[PDB]
Design a protein around this ligand. Sequence first.
Ligand SMILES: *[C@@H]1O[C@H](CO)[C@@H](O[C@@H]2O[C@H](CO)[C@@H](O[C@@H]3O[C@H](CO)[C@@H](O)[C@H](O)[C@@H]3O)[C@H](O)[C@H]2NC(C)=O)[C@H](O)[C@H]1NC(C)=O
Ligand SMILES: *[C@@H]1O[C@H](CO)[C@@H](O[C@@H]2O[C@H](CO)[C@@H](O[C@@H]3O[C@H](CO)[C@@H](O)[C@H](O)[C@@H]3O)[C@H](O)[C@H]2NC(C)=O)[C@H](O)[C@H]1NC(C)=O
Ligand SMILES: *[C@@H]1O[C@H](CO)[C@@H](O[C@@H]2O[C@H](CO)[C@@H](O[C@@H]3O[C@H](CO)[C@@H](O)[C@H](O)[C@@H]3O)[C@H](O)[C@H]2NC(C)=O)[C@H](O)[C@H]1NC(C)=O
Ligand SMILES: *[C@@H]1O[C@H](CO)[C@@H](O[C@@H]2O[C@H](CO)[C@@H](O[C@@H]3O[C@H](CO)[C@@H](O)[C@H](O)[C@@H]3O)[C@H](O)[C@H]2NC(C)=O)[C@H](O)[C@H]1NC(C)=O
Ligand SMILES: CCC[C@@H](CCO)Nc1nc(N)nc2cnn(Cc3cc(CN[C@@H]4COC[C@H]4O)ccc3OC)c12
Ligand SMILES: CCC[C@@H](CCO)Nc1nc(N)nc2cnn(Cc3cc(CN[C@@H]4COC[C@H]4O)ccc3OC)c12
Ligand SMILES: *[C@@H]1O[C@H](CO)[C@@H](O)[C@H](O)[C@H]1NC(C)=O
Ligand SMILES: *[C@@H]1O[C@H](CO)[C@@H](O)[C@H](O)[C@H]1NC(C)=O
Ligand SMILES: *[C@@H]1O[C@H](CO)[C@@H](O)[C@H](O)[C@H]1NC(C)=O
Ligand SMILES: *[C@@H]1O[C@H](CO)[C@@H](O)[C@H](O)[C@H]1NC(C)=O
Ligand SMILES: *[C@@H]1O[C@H](CO)[C@@H](O)[C@H](O)[C@H]1NC(C)=O
Ligand SMILES: *[C@@H]1O[C@H](CO)[C@@H](O)[C@H](O)[C@H]1NC(C)=O
Ligand SMILES: *[C@@H]1O[C@H](CO)[C@@H](O)[C@H](O)[C@H]1NC(C)=O
Ligand SMILES: *[C@@H]1O[C@H](CO)[C@@H](O)[C@H](O)[C@H]1NC(C)=O
Ligand SMILES: *[C@@H]1O[C@H](CO)[C@@H](O)[C@H](O)[C@H]1NC(C)=O
Ligand SMILES: *[C@@H]1O[C@H](CO)[C@@H](O)[C@H](O)[C@H]1NC(C)=O
Ligand SMILES: *[C@@H]1O[C@H](CO)[C@@H](O)[C@H](O)[C@H]1NC(C)=O
Ligand SMILES: *[C@@H]1O[C@H](CO)[C@@H](O)[C@H](O)[C@H]1NC(C)=O
Ligand SMILES: *[C@@H]1O[C@H](CO)[C@@H](O)[C@H](O)[C@H]1NC(C)=O
Ligand SMILES: *[C@@H]1O[C@H](CO)[C@@H](O)[C@H](O)[C@H]1NC(C)=O
Ligand SMILES: *[C@@H]1O[C@H](CO)[C@@H](O)[C@H](O)[C@H]1NC(C)=O
Ligand SMILES: *[C@@H]1O[C@H](CO)[C@@H](O)[C@H](O)[C@H]1NC(C)=O
Ligand SMILES: *[C@@H]1O[C@H](CO)[C@@H](O)[C@H](O)[C@H]1NC(C)=O
Ligand SMILES: *[C@@H]1O[C@H](CO)[C@@H](O)[C@H](O)[C@H]1NC(C)=O
Lengths: 747, 747
Amino acid sequence: RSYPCDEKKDSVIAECSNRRLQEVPQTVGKYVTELDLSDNFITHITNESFQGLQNLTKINLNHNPNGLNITDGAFLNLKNLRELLLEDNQLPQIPSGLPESLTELSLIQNNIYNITKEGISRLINLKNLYLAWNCYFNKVCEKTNIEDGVFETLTNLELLSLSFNSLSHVPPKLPSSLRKLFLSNTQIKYISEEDFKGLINLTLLDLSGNCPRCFNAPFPCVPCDGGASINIDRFAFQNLTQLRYLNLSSTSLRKINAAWFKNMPHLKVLDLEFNYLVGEIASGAFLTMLPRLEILDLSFNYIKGSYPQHINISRNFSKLLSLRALHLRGYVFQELREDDFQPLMQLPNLSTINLGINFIKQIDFKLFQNFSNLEIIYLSENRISPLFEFDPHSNFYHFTRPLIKPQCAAYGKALDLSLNSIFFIGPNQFENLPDIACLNLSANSNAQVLSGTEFSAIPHVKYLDLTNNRLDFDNASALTELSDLEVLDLSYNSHYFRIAGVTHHLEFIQNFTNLKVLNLSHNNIYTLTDKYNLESKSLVELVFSGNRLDILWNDDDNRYISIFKGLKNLTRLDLSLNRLKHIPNEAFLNLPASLTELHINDNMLKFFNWTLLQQFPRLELLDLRGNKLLFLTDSLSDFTSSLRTLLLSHNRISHLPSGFLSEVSSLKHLDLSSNLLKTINKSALETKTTTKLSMLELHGNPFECTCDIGDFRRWMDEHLNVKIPRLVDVICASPGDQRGKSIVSLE
Amino acid sequence: RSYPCDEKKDSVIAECSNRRLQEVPQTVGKYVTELDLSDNFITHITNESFQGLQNLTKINLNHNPNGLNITDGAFLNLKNLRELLLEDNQLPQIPSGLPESLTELSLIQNNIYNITKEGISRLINLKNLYLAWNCYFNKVCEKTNIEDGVFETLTNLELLSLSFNSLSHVPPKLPSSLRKLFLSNTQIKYISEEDFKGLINLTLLDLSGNCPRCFNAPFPCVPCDGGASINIDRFAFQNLTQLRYLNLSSTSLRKINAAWFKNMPHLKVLDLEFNYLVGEIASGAFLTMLPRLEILDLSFNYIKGSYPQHINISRNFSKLLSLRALHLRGYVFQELREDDFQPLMQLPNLSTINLGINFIKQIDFKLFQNFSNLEIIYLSENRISPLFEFDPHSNFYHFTRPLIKPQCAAYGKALDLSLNSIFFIGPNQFENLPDIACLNLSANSNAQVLSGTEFSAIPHVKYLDLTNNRLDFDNASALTELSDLEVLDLSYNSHYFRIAGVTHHLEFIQNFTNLKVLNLSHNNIYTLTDKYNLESKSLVELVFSGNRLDILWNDDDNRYISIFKGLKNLTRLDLSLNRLKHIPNEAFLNLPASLTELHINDNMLKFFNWTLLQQFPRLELLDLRGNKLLFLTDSLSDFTSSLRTLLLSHNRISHLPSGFLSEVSSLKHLDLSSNLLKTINKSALETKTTTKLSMLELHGNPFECTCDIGDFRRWMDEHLNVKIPRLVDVICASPGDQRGKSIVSLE
Ligand SMILES: *[C@@H]1O[C@H](CO)[C@@H](O[C@@H]2O[C@H](CO)[C@@H](O[C@@H]3O[C@H](CO)[C@@H](O)[C@H](O)[C@@H]3O)[C@H](O)[C@H]2NC(C)=O)[C@H](O)[C@H]1NC(C)=O
Ligand SMILES: *[C@@H]1O[C@H](CO)[C@@H](O[C@@H]2O[C@H](CO)[C@@H](O[C@@H]3O[C@H](CO)[C@@H](O)[C@H](O)[C@@H]3O)[C@H](O)[C@H]2NC(C)=O)[C@H](O)[C@H]1NC(C)=O
Ligand SMILES: *[C@@H]1O[C@H](CO)[C@@H](O[C@@H]2O[C@H](CO)[C@@H](O[C@@H]3O[C@H](CO)[C@@H](O)[C@H](O)[C@@H]3O)[C@H](O)[C@H]2NC(C)=O)[C@H](O)[C@H]1NC(C)=O
Ligand SMILES: *[C@@H]1O[C@H](CO)[C@@H](O[C@@H]2O[C@H](CO)[C@@H](O[C@@H]3O[C@H](CO)[C@@H](O)[C@H](O)[C@@H]3O)[C@H](O)[C@H]2NC(C)=O)[C@H](O)[C@H]1NC(C)=O
Ligand SMILES: CCC[C@@H](CCO)Nc1nc(N)nc2cnn(Cc3cc(CN[C@@H]4COC[C@H]4O)ccc3OC)c12
Ligand SMILES: CCC[C@@H](CCO)Nc1nc(N)nc2cnn(Cc3cc(CN[C@@H]4COC[C@H]4O)ccc3OC)c12
Ligand SMILES: *[C@@H]1O[C@H](CO)[C@@H](O)[C@H](O)[C@H]1NC(C)=O
Ligand SMILES: *[C@@H]1O[C@H](CO)[C@@H](O)[C@H](O)[C@H]1NC(C)=O
Ligand SMILES: *[C@@H]1O[C@H](CO)[C@@H](O)[C@H](O)[C@H]1NC(C)=O
Ligand SMILES: *[C@@H]1O[C@H](CO)[C@@H](O)[C@H](O)[C@H]1NC(C)=O
Ligand SMILES: *[C@@H]1O[C@H](CO)[C@@H](O)[C@H](O)[C@H]1NC(C)=O
Ligand SMILES: *[C@@H]1O[C@H](CO)[C@@H](O)[C@H](O)[C@H]1NC(C)=O
Ligand SMILES: *[C@@H]1O[C@H](CO)[C@@H](O)[C@H](O)[C@H]1NC(C)=O
Ligand SMILES: *[C@@H]1O[C@H](CO)[C@@H](O)[C@H](O)[C@H]1NC(C)=O
Ligand SMILES: *[C@@H]1O[C@H](CO)[C@@H](O)[C@H](O)[C@H]1NC(C)=O
Ligand SMILES: *[C@@H]1O[C@H](CO)[C@@H](O)[C@H](O)[C@H]1NC(C)=O
Ligand SMILES: *[C@@H]1O[C@H](CO)[C@@H](O)[C@H](O)[C@H]1NC(C)=O
Ligand SMILES: *[C@@H]1O[C@H](CO)[C@@H](O)[C@H](O)[C@H]1NC(C)=O
Ligand SMILES: *[C@@H]1O[C@H](CO)[C@@H](O)[C@H](O)[C@H]1NC(C)=O
Ligand SMILES: *[C@@H]1O[C@H](CO)[C@@H](O)[C@H](O)[C@H]1NC(C)=O
Ligand SMILES: *[C@@H]1O[C@H](CO)[C@@H](O)[C@H](O)[C@H]1NC(C)=O
Ligand SMILES: *[C@@H]1O[C@H](CO)[C@@H](O)[C@H](O)[C@H]1NC(C)=O
Ligand SMILES: *[C@@H]1O[C@H](CO)[C@@H](O)[C@H](O)[C@H]1NC(C)=O
Ligand SMILES: *[C@@H]1O[C@H](CO)[C@@H](O)[C@H](O)[C@H]1NC(C)=O
């Protein structure tokens, strides 16, 4: 059994991160090819640290300690080492004598202010070199000294990242093999004709944050003198014929020289966020030079103090023939009229329009159907009413997550109106809209009684998100006009459910023939009017977490005893966070017999009647984590033959009964972590048929490490197929001499 | 040192509740007079349980186990026992042979269905007898058999509670000493002329829940046949001359016979909630019979399916000369006009008007100034737009907490408009209002930019609650028209603070000369525009919990390093829940030197620079609970001489340095509970000057119970003035033979 790392298997990885290791372990497997030692307390690396580990092709030593002192030539003997990650290590210099076999070296987030030939010129096989985030913002640091011609001999270098360093000028003598050059936030004020002359294979250039736009910056921002623009020579990109990505975000540009794109026939992504381009958006000659551009980001170009009535889009936007996505967040305007987006309406592949954060008060929604083929209409965070801190591996100027949840967008045309003020959906709200399949009305402070007519203009919505509103469910016909509804999210609409004296109606759930997923989470549901039961012939998943089944299933009330029984097709049920101390036997028996997955985690269960699992012949996963269960049944095989996963972590199990792990043949994963187990007896492990378990979790139990743990230690040796992860965390609580150590220590 | 109970001192109480006791402890102090053993696991009480404890006047055995088996005459030997609480014990009968000295006996929430002479007729000194909640709702239980004349000989009985039992009729032969008779939810359908004839000292009668109004009930409700009213004979209350309280809530009354009140000259509180009295409210002859009534509750009398335009209040309400509070929640009407409350406007002491939960859409607010002296205008939970489950010791039909927070109401006239839809405050919103001192606009979905003019019609607001809105703090003059503002609550307005790209302005805080308390909690504040500092010459308390000081005080940003320095008069600061891993030394030094109380609890602090406490000579309380601190300074007296309270529970302190508890002379309370202390060495406790501590918390530490704990055990004996609460929870983690036991039980 591997210790202290966990080994996963054209390679074998030793997962050894975040285990409080004070030194590199001298017990790593001879066959290991990738060693992850990140987030440990290692303070020193010497030529003896990785001795006899010649198969290593990758080492990750990021975030060590919690600076790391690496001796000259510490990694020199590792002849197949290709990838070395040494991020966030407070390194004062590039380590000396690094192995010549390196193809990837990451030194992000260190204190390296000198890039010398001694450090990297001998690394002739380098393909990717990351030196970003060594001197930036108000960090006490020196200006970066790039030794003349340091990168020149790295003739296989394809990616060079020097962003978030004080460079002042583009380094001369860069190798012509470069494909991606990152120079964001480097204090480069001028780009000359010769700065990139030999870079004929360059596909990406990032010059963002040079002469930044600093008003309301969420980081320490130093603008160029007088808030001046970056000065790019007319011929600076004349030989960058292969450029596909260009990032000029936050370069304080007011004018874009169209000639910059004269010899960029393949430009695909142009990022111009955080500039002063309102004038250029209205009359952009550069827009005629970009017929293959697919993504154009012009977000946050607003004029401080100016809140115009309308957006002014140049007729030249009609020349962006290949445009697929247009981002115009933070332009800031009051109304979107149909005439305002006429230049975009004949672009055949424009599928995404992003107008988030524009303080838009009104939109003529009929304009969207006149676009060729919109698939994502993102209008989140507007004022529409009734009709280290930064991840160095992420985009600094915008979030990279999808605008709309992929599960919602997969259904078809999406309209996101979340975080607006549509407090009431009137009869004309969704008129003249395309066939919307995915609709998000989350966080619109909507307190209306939906009554079956509000969505009649878009009746083919398949995924509806109404979360975080104050909806008053007081009409049995609510949402029934949505005949094709498959996913309905009503999470966080507790406002009226929490008032006992008002009426509450959930009868509409029964009317849907295609409803698959329903989320009623965090609604504080504890009382219903007249109809106490949820019914659906189609529903497969119900999320009922954050409600009050402790009240609904109170021992003195029989009204909700069959609340979920009518969900005849249900396979997944989540009853977590319902303050349950016990479930009445009759209420558990009335859960749908079709269940395959049942979660009752994060309640306060003191008892669980295991005998009742007999009535659930399809139950594969039972999750009882985060409860107060004191014991386990000694005859689980008599009550279930389908259970494959049993999650019991964070409970108070102090003893396993005799014959527990052996008899349940279908059980593959048993999680007993964070319980109160002191020991595991020989009787508890084996009986007649050996264990069909493949994973047994035991970290966080207060084990007694005396000779009484010997039987379990021998069982672990005889059952190497049963994985017990994180042995470093399966720790001795007693006696004093063994406290803090893993149970696998002491013979 | 008392064990297992904690003794507080004309009596001495042994607080022994909720400590997992399996039996009554045989180590209670001889001098103890009140023993609280509630919420333990005691299963048996015998004549040996309280042997030699003759000074006991009160025993509380509620909620035991987690039924309790009490033998005949178990408490008979206790000659001064006056109060016996045996609630929630699943008792099948009233215990036999109870001591004759009893004056108070509570048997609430048991399985007692027979009240016999054998059980209580010998208890001639009984003053209060509680038998409520033994058979109710859908509990499987028998009808209550009251033996004829069982209470007749209890000639000192003043309070009898039989509520939530199936009685069917008022028991005959009740003693004339009765003052309070509770018969709520007892299935009594008829009240005859003789049911209370001899009860001439009765001050309270509760007949609620008999023939209940069951529509939308939040509990199992059985109405009288045909939803019929309770049938009260015309002469049923003719001799109840001393009645002050009458509860007829949920008796399905449609008519109130005015003759019922003909001989009740002192009636003060009349509860008529959950009835069908809309007609009676419009033409109530009974209102002329109640000139001394102070509280009238007519809540939840709405007509199902009827949402009238106006409320119809009889002119006879003008005859309620002594009325102080009128509760009209759940009447249900669309608009409140000035003409509608004319009958109430000349009542000189009417200080509270409660119109919560009426779905009111509009109010002519000018009507409130024409009332004689309104102090509480409660309009929470309406539709106003821009111009066991039940506690047996509480009121079942309404909450008893104050309508308005006492801290807000103490300032003067209060107007509560919380939970409405005043999403924008227009220039006439607060016109024609009285001099409002306390204003609650919480949860109104308000997303406006307050700009210094919204509150000009009520400029003397002292306590303003704007919590749980979507406020856009984007104007330096916000709220500055409120010159006398003392308390401002902006909690839970994170909507716009979360968005980096929008501007955020908190400059207005400086303009107030009388602002004492400011709550900016749970606002997710991580970026401000231009002015990075909070400033106030007056502010004494700032609650900044649930914000992002981890981002504001990021090591690479100097902009917020003096964020609180300008709060020159600050004494209390709460920095909890700010995800802090460390505070930069310069930022801690810029906290106001005027601080007396500083909370930094529930962060993730790994280090705390104790030396910096030198710059805080007035610091009395330091709260660092719920962090990851690994060690404590060995020279705290060199850094502070004012610190009185130091809270360090829920940290990772594994060792106390030498001379820690002895040298800090001002330290009175040190909380080290839930840390990783294995022992406390003799050197850590004493040095030259003995400890001035009065409370040392240590429960939850994994103590090693070998002879190495002997020195601390001897120190505990030599320092009985240093209180250590919950010794039952100061437990041995090792060796195995001592695990689970209290450290004081060792040897
Ligand atoms: C409908 O609109 C709402 C509001 O815009 C969407 O909610 C947002 O959902 C995202 C993705 O789940 C949340 O961000 C995520 O946060 C987690 C951490 O909590 C992080 O691990 C992820 O990387 C990601 O950043 C976001 O907080 C949430 N916003 C709010 C205000 O709730 C919702 O997803 C939309 N629904 C559909 C159907 O697209
Ligand atoms: C309300 O409940 C629904 C249903 O459970 C929530 O949506 C579901 O969210 C889970 C993640 O918690 C999604 O599963 C994940 O899918 C990805 C992609 O396949 C996978 O990589 C993950 O391992 C995981 O399986 C699930 O697909 C999604 N279902 C739907 C229909 O969208 C929803 O997030 C809940 N709403 C709130 C506000 O919490
Ligand atoms: C302004 O109006 C809001 C909304 O009505 C008031 O909030 C409410 O405050 C009460 C008292 O703090 C909360 O109830 C309490 O809950 C705790 C448990 O959380 C319980 O221990 C207490 O016995 C009591 O029931 C109530 O939850 C809360 N409601 C909401 C929706 O936030 C607020 O107090 C008002 N402010 C002033 C100045 O009067
Ligand atoms: C926003 O912060 C304010 C200021 O801390 C919160 O109000 C304060 O709440 C505390 C309780 O957490 C009150 O103290 C208590 O007072 C009672 C009565 O004197 C006493 O019995 C308790 O032992 C405790 O001392 C304090 O008086 C109150 N201050 C004011 C000015 O009202 C407020 O609750 C916070 N808002 C939210 C929504 O969390
Ligand atoms: C992404 C942009 C973020 C900032 C930028 C500020 O330059 N804009 C805004 N930030 C916040 N937080 N809330 C709002 C609300 N509207 N706008 C848009 C806006 C309104 C005006 C009118 N000025 C108000 C008139 O009355 C007195 C003044 O307060 C002027 C300019 C403007 O946006 C350019 C907001
Ligand atoms: C404290 C009272 C609780 C219940 C009682 C219902 O019997 N009332 C209400 N409960 C909830 N949750 N929300 C609302 C919103 N308004 N009202 C008041 C009300 C509205 C109508 C009109 N009927 C609707 C429109 O036509 C079709 C229906 O949907 C009729 C009667 C009525 O109150 C007596 C609500
Ligand atoms: C390298 O790994 C292979 C298995 O993949 C093993 O046979 C060989 O002995 C290893 N050599 C060293 C030096 O670790
Ligand atoms: C690095 O550690 C070596 C020993 O492993 C020591 O000799 C050397 O001084 C250390 N370097 C620094 C800068 O502390
Ligand atoms: C430029 O890239 C091509 C492949 O796209 C490659 O053949 C050529 O050698 C590269 N040039 C250099 C100098 O690496
Ligand atoms: C539009 O997208 C399709 C699909 O990739 C592609 O075939 C077509 O050439 C694109 N049209 C333009 C004008 O770029
Ligand atoms: C609709 O869009 C087309 C481009 O596809 C444009 O020619 C036409 O004028 C637009 N008409 C309206 C009414 O928007
Ligand atoms: C539900 O709302 C519709 C539309 O307003 C109404 O016609 C219907 O009567 C309502 N149903 C009930 C039972 O209130
Ligand atoms: C909803 O379904 C029920 C049958 O369960 C039916 O009585 C009702 O009319 C349906 N309403 C709509 C609008 O489909
Ligand atoms: C049950 O669920 C499956 C899977 O989603 C679905 O195909 C089937 O139609 C559902 N059954 C009914 C009766 O709707
Ligand atoms: C499980 O529930 C049944 C009733 O459905 C009951 O007979 C049985 O005693 C329960 N099991 C336990 C262990 O209490
Ligand atoms: C009763 O308490 C007093 C002290 O208040 C003590 O002197 C006396 O001995 C006690 N008697 C018994 C029997 O506990
Ligand atoms: C109560 O306990 C006594 C012993 O203390 C036992 O003899 C008796 O049977 C118990 N009563 C019941 C009903 O279990
Ligand atoms: C009625 O109460 C008075 C005191 O208010 C008391 O003197 C009188 O004895 C009481 N009557 C009975 C029968 O207890
Ligand atoms: C009004 O209250 C005051 C203060 O308690 C009291 O003196 C006065 O008698 C009351 N007036 C009426 C009409 O009840
Ligand atoms: C104002 O209230 C008084 C009673 O105090 C009443 O006589 C008068 O008619 C009311 N006038 C208006 C305009 O409400
Ligand atoms: C704040 O709002 C007021 C009132 O609308 C306006 O006069 C003032 O210019 C605003 N201040 C700023 C700096 O925007
Ligand atoms: C707020 O205070 C500042 C001084 O700090 C002053 O310049 C400004 O005019 C004040 N505004 C108001 C409305 O009091
Ligand atoms: C400081 O706070 C005290 C106590 O609230 C207050 O009396 C005093 O006026 C405040 N100081 C100033 C300058 O406002
Ligand atoms: C405390 O902070 C000061 C700077 O204000 C620094 O000199 C000192 O080293 C810090 N103390 C510790 C223990 O780090």
